[PDB]
Every structure is written in structure tokens, then in C-alpha cells.
Amino acid sequence: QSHIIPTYKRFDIVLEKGQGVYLFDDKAKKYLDFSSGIGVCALGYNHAKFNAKIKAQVDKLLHTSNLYYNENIAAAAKNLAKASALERVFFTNSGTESIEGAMKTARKYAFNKGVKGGQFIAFKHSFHGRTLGALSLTANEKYQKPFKPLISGVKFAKYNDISSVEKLVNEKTCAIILESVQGEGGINPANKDFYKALRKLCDEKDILLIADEIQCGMGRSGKFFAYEHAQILPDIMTSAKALGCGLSVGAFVINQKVASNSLEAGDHGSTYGGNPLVCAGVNAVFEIFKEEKILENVNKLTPYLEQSLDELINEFDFCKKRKGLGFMQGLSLDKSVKVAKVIQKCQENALLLISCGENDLRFLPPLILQKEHIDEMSEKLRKALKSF
Amino acid sequence: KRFDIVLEKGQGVYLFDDKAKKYLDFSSGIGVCALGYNHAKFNAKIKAQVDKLLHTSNLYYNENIAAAAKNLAKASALERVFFTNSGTESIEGAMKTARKYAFNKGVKGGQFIAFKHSFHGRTLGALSLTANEKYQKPFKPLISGVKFAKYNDISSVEKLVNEKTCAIILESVQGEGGINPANKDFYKALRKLCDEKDILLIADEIQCGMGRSGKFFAYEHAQILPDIMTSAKALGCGLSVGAFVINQKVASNSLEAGDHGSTYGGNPLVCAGVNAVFEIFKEEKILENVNKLTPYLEQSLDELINEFDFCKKRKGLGFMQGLSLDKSVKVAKVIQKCQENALLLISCGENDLRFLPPLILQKEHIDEMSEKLRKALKSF
Ligand SMILES: [Mg+2]
Ligand SMILES: [Mg+2]
Ligand SMILES: [Mg+2]
Ligand SMILES: [Mg+2]
């Protein structure tokens, strides 16, 4: 996961095309996609409105470089600033690049207050990216070992445990960074009380709160960003994946406090990064989310999704606990059943799921999902589970 | 920095601003848009893939990605391709691969030798390979284990080598830090040295690669092959994509890398783009065009050095050229005057004009650049 992925970790399936919530392999087999390409394809596949906006921009301009302005980029930044409720957007090409941008920003914020070598508190069981800065933010020595030494100055607390955070704070701490919903060690949403405690701690100590919304952001929680459920605002947030619904784009957004103390004289005061194509995509995502009432759809269907998963937990002893937020759900399985084998049976049954944690199923359906697809998922997954 | 120009669209080698003013583009979006703008065949190939699938994740296979890797492996002359989203991500991947290579040989915490005036990217790993302390200062500490040699000076490299050195990385033509091509003999000496010490030679071809030098990759001019190379920018001709490519030696010393079914990144859309770039390059004989026109391009820049006292030196390779200006004339103002004259140039180095025209350039366009640049130079 930290570097190059070997054959045994990938699926023996060649995908060719998609339509709505379905993906088709090279044998024309139709699968219900309940993974969204790992939380990326919020609008499913070949969404007519999305594809039209992308194609129109292809015929206009793909790339300008940061040396010039483009209206698409300004409009996309405005959209994301409004949705995140932060102030200044910096577009990147990926989630991991956004994480790097956030780290640099937090380091510079500290440096400008005369704190050199700002340190980071992150959380065990999280993963933030494969580039060397982001990789320094994972506690698992396994993901790091051959690449050390990495970025020093990172310490690891326990997710949802405020006392473990307080214990590690000092005069040199520049940021606390958390995924709003963990995945690496299993799906695990940040508690509302924990997000509030962190916001208060960060206020009191002038430490930057960094919300990593790459996996859970852009509508999947039923709000644009999962931290909204806790009614706090971070000082910096990162977003990617569904931000571009399939196009390569990422961003780190910072509030006015950070902006006023980290950007130097020479700042043009405008958006940084991005290109006209992917930003046309970002604008499309926001416009379509609004028109098709996608947040409303997630909120409407989340109770049914959770109910359906809980029914499977009731029916099968080896299905243990469900955790999740909106359309980001996880189900832990007993060691008596291998998750990879459950996933194989599902694929045979024309259902695409993925895993996380020790032995857990992960559910990340497209946000355009209908109730009928939840029933289809339940039917196919039930058939798989019955064989164990 | 940012110019006060809003770009809206382009056609061929021309870009248009939001007032419909037409500019000759001699920068290619900083070396990215090799096929210029709105190439009809390129765009048709992209839109075709938009209608199929944009994204799979690395858990599944896709024919476009396999074909793109095959194309890049062949053009590079290296064994395995790992796609990323950007140049800086490719550098990070190359660094990790180099460290892991040494790690498996029993050498922990492999060190890197980079070169002064280099630029490799903005992410924390790539930034560690950047020479100037002013890019790094507030972000420190960065990745430990980087030392900096003098470019084209094999002696300075030898002095920095030790038991922990796992890689020597260079741009085949230094760009952002001032246009400066690696000398043939220096590249051969690096290859020889890396061979003898089992140190990985990493060629950063992000700026100078994908045909700009007249060959697919600039290191081909030295008739050497690196152990790892990085590509981006023109690799996608406007689409966001990067790659780090490794040879058999590196692949076979990594369980994951040597595995034929292995992957890093990439997606069907950008990889369809990569395949279109290779098909078009071949079909339209892009490399031949660069070789045909480079002499005339260089001649035209040379004619400006003779003409204007403050135009000092020209250095370059193929369609990557730089022209240094005396301290007496600020390059930023020359660039502004060129924009008035409807020509888009950029800068590099201490006070230098950087020329990165689209590879679809025609002789006529060089004459246009000359007349507009001369007009600007005459005003100083
Ligand atoms: Mg409690
Ligand atoms: Mg709590
Ligand atoms: Mg049960
Ligand atoms: Mg419904």
C-alpha cells in the first residue's frame, strides 16, 4: 500500500466501461459497483452531465500552467471554498500532494511564529498517502521500514482518545492531523465529541487542526465534509478523489488565520494550482450535486443502507460489527472467514466490494445509488455469505 | 509568479486570452503541451475514453494502462513503468524505489546525490533534492541523506559518494535552475561510476523528455541508460500524469517491482492520452520535426546575442533553449514586452529567457518569435 502493489493484492478483472452504478469487465460482465473505485466515482460511470462538461472543456483548453489565470480554476476554488467554509484553495493533482501541501503550510505557519521544525501529531491506524511527507504520517512501521529515514517530527496518538493527544503536545507542535473517518484499521468515524475536543485544544494552543477529508469528503457523509457533522471547522483541510469524480485533482484549503500568517509578501491573493480540465470537472461535480440533490439522496438512503447491513450482521454469526457514516460503511468479519474470499464470491455474484482493516468489508457505493441497488447488493452479498 | 493574462482557449501553437487576443506560445505551458492546443486527433482520442471509463483504481486492470506502460517502456528502453499523477510524485516514487533497492542489499537509509541548480518537485521528498536552501528553509527538517554536487563535474560527485549512497539523480537538461544540458562525457562517467559502485543512476526527464530533445529522452543523446527515469508533462500533453520507470536490475531486486502484474498508479483516461501521444508522435514524425527545425531555432537565438549587447549566452538541446541576459535588463520586463507583442516566453536561472515551443512548431513560427522578441529587445 505504501509503494508498488503486487499481483496478489489486485483483482483478476479487467474493467472496460461503466454505466450508472454498474461496471463492465472485458467479458461484458455487469457488476454492481459498491466501491466507487475506492470512494472516487461519486457520480458513478458515464454520467451524461459530467461527461458533457468534461468533453466541452477538452475542446477548449487542457492546461495553462500556474503562470496564467483561467476562469474554470477561479470558479472551482469559489465552489470549494464555499463548501468547505474555509477561505483559500490550493489545487493539486492528488490526495497525497494535498497532504504534502498541508504539512508544508503548517510548518511555515509555525516557522513564521518563530517555531522552527514544527511537529505533527497523527493517529495510529490511519494512512494519508504514499509520497514521503504523507508516508511519515502513518504509524505502521511496515509501510515505512525500507524508506526510512522519513520526515522526523511526527508522533502518533490514539484515534478518538483526547488524552493520548494532549500527552504528545508541546511548544513545537504545529498541527494535529486526522482523517475525519479512518479506514486503514477498519472504518472508524471520528466522534463528534472528539472533533470538538480537538478544535478546543487547537484553539487554546495555537496548533493547526488539519482535517483529511480525502476518503470521506465531497458528499459521502451526507454533508459536503464529514467534519460538518461535528459542527467544527478545521484550520486546513484536504480533499481529493470525489472532488474530481474520476479526474486527477486534489486540494488543500486553509482558513484566513493560516492564510494571514503563512503566505509571504508576493502572494497574488488568488488560487494556486489546478488546470482548466480538472477544475471544469470540479465545477461539474458541484453543479450536478446541486441539481440532482445528491446530499439529499445520501441522507435519504443512509438509514436503509445501515439497516440492510445490520440485517446481514443478524443473519450471520461471523459478521460482527458495522461502523460508518453516510455512504462510507465497514463490516468486520470473524477470522473464521477470510475477507478476500468473501470478496471473490461477491465478484462471482456480480458485486464489487473491497476490504480494509484486519478482515473487514468496506462499502463505498456511488452517491447516485438507488434503494433498488441496496437491495441488489444485499441479495448478492447474502448469497456469498450463505456459502460460508 | 503570475501574469495578468486569463487564457481561454488555443489552436495549434496559438493561445487566446479572455479578450480574444492571439499569442504565439513559445512556452507550451512550461514544456507540457507538446502537441500544442486542440490537436484534433489527440482530442478525439481523449473524448473517446471519456465515453468509456475515467477511473478504475489500482485494484483492477485496464487495457489502456497496460498499453501505455508498454509504449513508455519501449520508448524509454527500460523494463517497467509505474504511473503517477505528476512529476513530483514520480520523483518520490523513484526515491522510494532507490532506497528500497539499497535496503534489500542490506544498506539502510540510502543517501542521494543531487546537483546544484536542480529542481525536482515541491512535495517533501522531491523538495529534499532541490539545491537552493530558500525553497526549503521554513519546511525543514526534510529528508535526510541528500548531498549536492556540481553539474557536469564528475569529480564533485566522486567526493560525495560513500557506503550509504544509493542513487545519483540528475535532470538530463537542467531547466528551472537555468538551461544547462548534461554533457555526453559526464553522463557516461556517471553511468560508469554507478555501474562500479552499484549506485542507481536516476534520470529526471520530466522537463526535457518526451521528444523535446529530438529523441524520446535526452539521455539517449549520451547513449547511456539510467536505472530509473522519471517522465511527466509532455507524457500526457496536458493531462495530469507522471511515471517512474525502472530497468531489469532494479525490477528483479524488488519482489513487487519484478512481478509482471504489479502497478503503482495511472487511470484509463490519462493512459489513453499517453497512447494517443505516442501514436501521434509516430504518425506525424514529431521527433523529425524537432530535429529538422532545431538548427534554425538555435541560429535565430544566436542572431539576437550578436545583435544585443545584453544578450549573453545560448545553451540548449533541441526545443529546450535558454538565453541569458545581463543584469542591466530584467528578464521579467522583457517577458512583459513580449506579451504586448503577442509572444509567450518564460524565464529561468538568474535572469534568463526560457524557450519551450510546442513540438508541432513550424519554421514560420520561429520567424514570428524572432520578430516579436527582437521588437521587445529593441525597446531596452
Ligand atoms: Mg467519553
Ligand atoms: Mg470522544
Ligand atoms: Mg452476526
Ligand atoms: Mg431510491
From Swiss-Prot, chain B:
Transmembrane regions listed in the UniProt entry: none
UniProt-listed Pfam families: Aminotran_3
Cofactor(s) this protein cannot do without: pyridoxal 5'-phosphate
Residue positions binding N(2)-acetyl-L-ornithine: 122, 262
Organism in which the protein naturally occurs: Campylobacter jejuni subsp. jejuni serotype O:2 (strain ATCC 700819 / NCTC 11168)
Catalytic activity entry: N(2)-acetyl-L-ornithine + 2-oxoglutarate = N-acetyl-L-glutamate 5-semialdehyde + L-glutamate
GO MF term list: identical protein binding; N2-acetyl-L-ornithine:2-oxoglutarate 5-aminotransferase activity; pyridoxal phosphate binding
Cross-referenced CDD domains: OAT_like (cd00610)
Miscellaneous section: May also have succinyldiaminopimelate aminotransferase activity, thus carrying out the corresponding step in lysine biosynthesis.
Binding annotation for pyridoxal 5'-phosphate: 87-88, 119, 204-207, 263
EC number, as in UniProt: 2.6.1.11
Principal subcellular localisation of the protein: cytoplasm
Subcellular location: Cytoplasm
Annotated keywords: Amino-acid biosynthesis, Aminotransferase, Arginine biosynthesis, Cytoplasm, Pyridoxal phosphate, Transferase
Protein name as annotated: Acetylornithine aminotransferase
GO BP term (any one): L-arginine biosynthetic process
InterPro entries in UniProt: AcOrn/SuccOrn_fam, Aminotrans_3, Aminotrans_3_PPA_site, Class-III_PLP-dep_AT, PyrdxlP-dep_Trfase, PyrdxlP-dep_Trfase_major, PyrdxlP-dep_Trfase_small
PANTHER family (alphabetical): ACETYLORNITHINE AMINOTRANSFERASE, MITOCHONDRIAL, AMINOTRANSFERASE CLASS III
Leader sequence segment: none
Modification sites for N6-(pyridoxal phosphate)lysine: 233
Subunit and interaction comment: Homodimer.
